[PDB]
């Protein structure tokens, strides 16, 4: 699998649709809407060894497992708050209580002195557009301060032709007059790079 | 560096400690001040 | 999650009788199981205030990582070819999935019929990147390895979600593993509760089990302070 | 075996069963017969539309925590409890420019009805085609087989 | 051209006199409100004081520094620190100003808005320049020092609106009138003998037809045609007080349409 | 001391939607939209535009108390017409009116030499 995240900094709630139509003649079908939470935590340790970030990102995918990936210093930790995702063996030997919660809840309620939530960007009612061997997800990101931008999630099973697929979408962005945007297809396990890409495109 | 106390009139710095004599060096006057914290204070401009 | 529980114990010699009793009482023979737990604490080299962004007091606590291991990793050569059943206990790139837990000291109250402990848990599924080892990840959170222990035992599934564990615990260090439970088994009966009703109902289930074993083996509420993982 | 397993592993508590889910002794069994009928008609259709039309052709059917001791016992009866499926591969003569390949798979997802899956590819990388199809009606498989043999298989 | 129309009467760096016809009073007003309150500006918001030997209080001075107008032309390419991703402030969200002053002179040493220096990187955008309208080119008089009177401080200017603080108010008084002959009967003139003799005639009377007594009351008549004057403080140019005002109100309405859309 | 933060006037609260549309019980085809972190600036503007809509039977807004930046707007339309749609159209009309106003000001300003 492969992926890329495009974040349109300069944009408005409408930009989503404008790009949605530039694909009207490339679309095939539309699957269920998706959601996503993007959190930023700042470390409160004051002796922090030089060149160790003080920043940690938390990317929560909704029904991509209700999973949350933690990213810090180019490293990622995949977690889940879904009892249904618990490895059977951990439930059997008692390692798990069978009733997990979010790593973010733990961070804010048990480790809040060490980690403070700085920002919380949410993307609701996203759209899953299905093209030719390229799935394109679109969602408007909002902060506690109103609109924050447009986010494009590009997932493609086709390991081959991809660099072309990404360039194509960036083109339709030029058409809708969407200039000054950031694109990431970097890498560090799918869910991890995807999470990483959001970070690169938003940080 | 360091000015523990200042003089009230002549404004000459003093820097004295406990049981040193509460007076200024040249002028008599036992008045003496404290000199601002080096822990810089920030204010909202509203 | 709220874990309601009661504890007890028996010496090695009480094993067979207890297994026989629990097998008749529950209807099922025991099930062998193990788990490795690694406990971590805030890095002492780093120091942070103990307060919120809202300037509210936060108490430093330990984080517990737990998983299983294939039984074959616990059976040496002398242990070789011995029924892999309840009787065995007598003769005693990326990271793996782990259970991450932080617990609170049990609920206060004189004359508590059971111990009641709140447990915050999340699941670690995998990792990637430079420092992907669970150890590095814990360090990234600002924690360091403190200690770890292995627990081997048999469990029984009973009605209403009641579970009974007969366990042996070994602390693990290069200097050697020492059996914390040397002499016998730690007995634990508990139910995990995700409404007041279900809480009073769960207490009843535990109380009936205590009642049903009265005379034979006693189950009681351990000291709150003995179930407090806060760092100090 | 299933109820017990359902009790051993998950519940910490009691079983949960459904007649519909848990329904099948006899209903799952009857399907065995209806499938045999269905497979018969399918082979007839194939003979008519394909085998008789293209001379060399023929057809070959093919088979498509530690409780493990329990899962092994139940796995043994997967033979009886599986949704019935056979794959009928049609052998076609190799054209020296390209080798066409055709196969059909018959299955009964709800045990009493039939689905027919047809795959056809005769690649010449200039002419290369691929079909992946699903039909619930023998009438349409005749029409699609006809279409296929006509254009692609025939001389 | 289309819908509501403008007809500018006078222009300068500081004033826009115009006539707004084919508009709802509600719209004229809503624009008037926005210009006063919701247009963003840059203004000093944090003042770290290193030294102050002055006759004035740390916060007394601090307060004044907020009221000093700063160049907010390119205010739109600066982020609100609240929305910004740093820890406190940065370049993407603030302008750092510095002020060091000392009484070298035997005579009284003055401290002006000109004595402010930008220390942050401007990203080459028209921002944070103390607005100097002053003939002698000094700008706002912040303080007066004597001899050993030193004032050493640091200012963090941030994007904001007049709703949070009146320092982020880009507009001075906005003049607003309609129907200079009370044709609409929107006021009952208080008088002693004659309301016509007693009450002064508006300037705008010249831009409208007098009612002519030998006519019945026009009830059907509605309020369109508004004589306004927009005065700028400096932060934004007079025209842009009007334009940005029109745009803010437009954006404000769009948010509602969008809110309904998400619902 | 008992003074609320100034941003509370415009910055939405934790889990607080701009709009909350509740239906009016007392009247058919009538609704009540509560606008959080908003004032007269928007209320009176919208109310006045809905008044221009012929298919709109009732429209009024009220700031129930000045300590709080929020207003309730009540919309009643003719049967078949939706009040949310009525609000949508009035919102649009306003924008299009402002769009022309800007264009017209810009043109007129450019003509001035001062
Ligand atoms: Zn002296
Ligand atoms: Zn910043």
Curated annotation (Swiss-Prot), chain A:
UniProt keyword annotation of Transcription regulation present: yes
GO biological-process terms attached to the record: cellular response to nutrient levels; negative regulation of ribosomal protein gene transcription by RNA polymerase II; positive regulation of transcription by RNA polymerase II; positive regulation of transcription elongation by RNA polymerase II; positive regulation of transcription initiation by RNA polymerase II; regulation of transcription by RNA polymerase II; RNA polymerase II preinitiation complex assembly
Consequence recorded when altering residue 13 to H: In SRB2-1; suppresses the phenotypic defects of an RNA polymerase II CTD truncation
Keywords, comma-separated and alphabetical: Activator, Nucleus, Transcription, Transcription regulation
Any single Gene Ontology cellular-component annotation: nucleus
Keyword Nucleus in annotation: yes
InterPro entries found in the cross-reference section: Med20, Mediator_Med20
Cell compartments where the protein resides: Nucleus
GO molecular function terms listed in the Swiss-Prot or TrEMBL record: protein domain specific binding; TFIID-class transcription factor complex binding; transcription coactivator activity
Pfam families per UniProt: Med20 (PF08612)
Miscellaneous comment text of the record: Present with 1720 molecules/cell in log phase SD medium.
Similarity remark: Belongs to the Mediator complex subunit 20 family.
Protein name: Mediator of RNA polymerase II transcription subunit 20
Organism: Saccharomyces cerevisiae (strain ATCC 204508 / S288c)
Swiss-Prot record, chain B:
Keyword match Secreted: no
Swiss-Prot/TrEMBL keywords: DNA-directed RNA polymerase, Metal-binding, Nucleus, Peroxisome, Ribosome biogenesis, Transcription, Zinc, Zinc-finger
Protein modification: The N-terminus is blocked.
Gene Ontology biological-process entries: nucleolar large rRNA transcription by RNA polymerase I; ribosome biogenesis; RNA-templated transcription; termination of RNA polymerase I transcription; termination of RNA polymerase III transcription; transcription by RNA polymerase I; transcription by RNA polymerase II; transcription by RNA polymerase III
Zinc fingers, C4-type class: 7-27
Binding site for Zn(2+): 7, 10, 24, 27
Top-level division of the source organism's lineage: Eukaryota
GO molecular function: DNA binding; DNA-directed RNA polymerase activity; zinc ion binding
Keyword Zinc-finger tagged: yes
Gene Ontology CC annotations of this record: cytoplasm; nucleolus; nucleoplasm; nucleus; peroxisome; RNA polymerase I complex; RNA polymerase II, core complex; RNA polymerase III complex
Compartment(s): Nucleus, Nucleolus; Peroxisome
Main location: nucleus
Complex formation: Component of the RNA polymerase I (Pol I), RNA polymerase II (Pol II) and RNA polymerase III (Pol III) complexes. Component of the RNA polymerase I (Pol I) complex consisting of 14 subunits: RPA135, RPA190, RPC40, RPA14, RPB5, RPO26, RPA43, RPB8, RPA12, RPB10, RPC19, RPC10, RPA49 and RPA34. The complex is composed of a horseshoe-shaped core containing ten subunits (RPA135, RPA190, RPB5, RPO26, RPB8, RPB10, RPC10, RPA12, RPC19 and RPC40) where RPA135 and RPA190 form the DNA-binding cleft.
Residues of the full protein shown: 25 to 70 of 70
From Swiss-Prot, chain C:
Keyword set includes Transcription: yes
Cell compartments where the protein resides: Nucleus
Effect ascribed to mutating residue 21 to I: In SRB5-1; suppresses the phenotypic defects of an RNA polymerase II CTD truncation
Pfam family, one: Med18
InterPro entries linked to this entry: Mediator_Med18
Function statement: Component of the Mediator complex, a coactivator involved in the regulated transcription of nearly all RNA polymerase II-dependent genes. Mediator functions as a bridge to convey information from gene-specific regulatory proteins to the basal RNA polymerase II transcription machinery. The Mediator complex, having a compact conformation in its free form, is recruited to promoters by direct interactions with regulatory proteins and serves for the assembly of a functional preinitiation complex with RNA polymerase II and the general transcription factors.
Name of the molecule in the record: Mediator of RNA polymerase II transcription subunit 18
Organism: Saccharomyces cerevisiae (strain ATCC 204508 / S288c) (Baker's yeast)
UniProtKB/Swiss-Prot annotation, chain E:
Subcellular locations according to the entry: Nucleus
Residues annotated as binding Zn(2+): 84, 86, 90, 93
Record keywords, A-Z: Acetylation, DNA-directed RNA polymerase, Metal-binding, Nucleus, Transcription, Zinc
Gene Ontology molecular function: DNA binding; DNA-directed RNA polymerase activity; metal ion binding; protein dimerization activity
GO biological-process terms attached to the record: RNA-templated transcription; termination of RNA polymerase II transcription; transcription by RNA polymerase II; transcription elongation by RNA polymerase II; transcription initiation at RNA polymerase II promoter
GO CC annotation: nucleoplasm; nucleus; RNA polymerase II, core complex
Purpose of the protein: DNA-dependent RNA polymerase catalyzes the transcription of DNA into RNA using the four ribonucleoside triphosphates as substrates. Component of RNA polymerase II which synthesizes mRNA precursors and many functional non-coding RNAs. Pol II is the central component of the basal RNA polymerase II transcription machinery. It is composed of mobile elements that move relative to each other. RPB3 is part of the core element with the central large cleft and the clamp element that moves to open and close the cleft. Seems to be involved in transcription termination.
Other comments on record: Present with 10000 molecules/cell in log phase SD medium.
Subunit structure: Component of the RNA polymerase II (Pol II) complex consisting of 12 subunits.
Annotated family: Belongs to the archaeal Rpo3/eukaryotic RPB3 RNA polymerase subunit family.
């Amino acid at each position: 699998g492969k992926s890329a995240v495009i974040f349109v900094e300069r944009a408005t709630p409408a930009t989503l649709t404008e790009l949605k139509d530039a694909l009207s003649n490339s679309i095939l079908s539309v699957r269920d809407p998706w959601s996503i939470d993007f959190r930023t935590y700042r470390c409160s340790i004051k002796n922090l060894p030089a060149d160790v970030s003080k920043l940690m990102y938390s990317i929560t995918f909704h029904h991509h497992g209700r999973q949350t990936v933690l990213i810090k210093d180019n490293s990622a930790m995949v977690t889940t708050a879904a009892a249904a995702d618990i490895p059977p063996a951990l439930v059997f030997n008692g390692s798990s209580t069978g009733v997990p919660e979010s790593i973010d809840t733990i961070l804010s309620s048990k480790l809040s002195n060490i980690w403070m939530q700085r920002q919380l960007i949410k993307g609701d009612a996203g759209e899953t557009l299905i093209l030719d061997g390229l799935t394109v997800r679109l969602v408007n990101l909002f902060s506690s301060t109103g609109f924050k931008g447009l986010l494009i999630e590009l997932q493609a099973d086709e390991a081959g032709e991809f660099e072309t697929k990404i360039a194509g979408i960036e083109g339709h962005l030029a058409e809708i007059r969407a200039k000054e945007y950031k694109t990431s297809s970097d890498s560090l396990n799918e869910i991890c790079d995807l999470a990483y890409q959001y970070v690169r495109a938003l940080e | 560096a360091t000015l523990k106390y200042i003089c009230a009139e002549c404004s000459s710095k003093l820097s004295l400690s406990r049981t040193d004599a509460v007076r200024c060096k040249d002028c008599g006057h036992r008045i003496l001040l404290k000199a601002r914290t080096k822990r810089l204070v920030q204010f909202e401009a509203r | 999650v709220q874990q309601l529980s009661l504890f007890g114990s028996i010496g090695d010699d009480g094993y067979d009788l207890l297994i026989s009793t629990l097998t008749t009482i529950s209807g099922n023979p025991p099930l062998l199981y193990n788990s490795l737990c690694t406990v971590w604490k805030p890095n002492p080299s780093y120091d942070v205030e103990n307060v919120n962004s809202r300037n509210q007091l936060v108490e430093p606590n330990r984080i517990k990582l737990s998983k299983e291991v294939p039984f074959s990793y616990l059976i040496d050569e002398t242990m070789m070819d011995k029924p892999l059943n309840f009787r065995i206990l007598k003769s005693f790139e990326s990271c793996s999935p782990w259970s991450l837990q932080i617990s609170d000291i049990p609920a206060a109250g004189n004359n508590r019929s059971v111990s009641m402990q709140t447990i915050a848990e999340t699941i670690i599924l995998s990792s990637a990147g430079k420092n992907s080892s669970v150890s590095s990840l814990m360090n990234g959170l600002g924690y360091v390895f403190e200690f770890q222990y292995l627990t081997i035992g048999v469990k029984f599934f009973m009605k209403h979600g009641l579970i009974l564990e007969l366990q042996k615990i070994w602390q693990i260090e290069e200097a050697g593993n020492s059996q914390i439970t040397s002499g016998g088994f730690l007995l634990k009966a508990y139910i995990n509760v995700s409404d007041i009703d279900r809480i009073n109902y769960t207490e009843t289930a535990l109380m009936n089990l205590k009642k049903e074993l009265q005379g034979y083996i006693e189950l009681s509420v351990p000291d709150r302070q003995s179930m407090d993982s806060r760092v100090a | 075996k299933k109820t017990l397993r359902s009790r051993i592993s998950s519940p910490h508590g009691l079983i949960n069963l459904n007649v519909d889910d848990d329904i099948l002794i006899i209903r799952p069994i009857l399907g065995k017969v209806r499938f045999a009928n269905y497979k018969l008609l399918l082979k007839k259709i194939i003979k008519d539309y394909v085998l008789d039309i293209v001379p060399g052709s023929s057809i070959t059917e093919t088979e498509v925590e530690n409780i493990t001791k329990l899962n092994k016992e139940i796995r043994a009866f997967d033979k009886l409890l599986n949704i019935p499926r056979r794959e009928l591969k049609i052998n076609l003569p190799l054209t020296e420019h390209k080798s066409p390949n055709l196969s059909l798979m018959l299955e009964s997802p709800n045990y009493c009805n039939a689905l027919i899956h047809i795959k056809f590819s005769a690649g010449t990388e200039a002419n290369a085609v691929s079909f992946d199809t699903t039909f619930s009606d023998f009438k349409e498989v005749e029409d699609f087989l006809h279409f296929i043999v006509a254009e692609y298989i025939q001389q | 051209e289309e819908g509501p129309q403008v007809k500018i009467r006078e222009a300068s760096k500081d004033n826009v006199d115009f006539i707004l016809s084919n508009v709802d009073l509600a719209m004229a007003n809503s624009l008037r409100r926005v210009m006063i309150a919701e247009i963003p500006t840059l203004a000093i918001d944090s003042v770290e004081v290193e030294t102050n030997t002055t006759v004035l209080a740390d916060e007394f001075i601090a307060h004044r520094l907020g009221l000093i107008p700063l160049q907010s032309m390119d205010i739109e390419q600066l982020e609100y620190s609240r929305d910004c991703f740093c820890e406190d402030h940065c370049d993407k969200c603030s302008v750092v100003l510095t002020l060091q002053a000392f009484g070298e002179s035997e005579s009284t040493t003055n401290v002006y808005s000109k004595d402010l220096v930008i220390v942050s990187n401007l990203m080459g955008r028209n921002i944070g320049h103390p607005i100097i309208q002053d003939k002698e080119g000094n700008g706002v008089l912040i303080c007066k020092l004597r001899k050993g009177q030193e004032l050493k401080l640091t200012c963090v200017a941030k994007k904001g609106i007049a709703k949070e603080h009146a320092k982020w108010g880009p507009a001075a008084a906005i003049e607003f009138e309609y129907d200079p002959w009370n044709k609409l009967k929107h006021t009952d003139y208080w008088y002693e003998q004659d309301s016509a003799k007693e009450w002064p005639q508006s300037k705008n009377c010249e831009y409208e037809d007098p009612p002519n007594e030998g006519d019945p009351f026009d009830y059907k008549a509605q309020a369109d045609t508004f004589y306004m004057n927009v005065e700028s403080v400096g932060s934004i140019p007079v025209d842009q007080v009007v334009v940005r005002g029109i745009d803010t109100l437009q954006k404000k309405v769009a948010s509602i349409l969008l809110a309904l859309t998400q619902m | 001391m008992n003074a609320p933060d100034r941003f509370e006037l415009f910055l939405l609260g934790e889990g607080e939607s701009k709009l909350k549309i509740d239906p009016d019980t007392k009247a058919p085809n009538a609704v009540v939209i509560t606008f959080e972190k908003e004032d007269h600036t928007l209320g009176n503007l919208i109310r006045a535009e809905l008044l221009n809509d012929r298919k709109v039977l009732f429209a009024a807004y009220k700031v129930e108390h000045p300590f709080f930046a929020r207003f309730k707007l009540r919309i009643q339309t003719t049967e078949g017409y939706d009040p949310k749609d009525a609000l949508k159209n009035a919102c649009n009309s306003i924008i299009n009116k402002l769009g022309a106003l800007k264009t017209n000001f810009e043109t007129e300003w450019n003509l001035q030499t001062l």
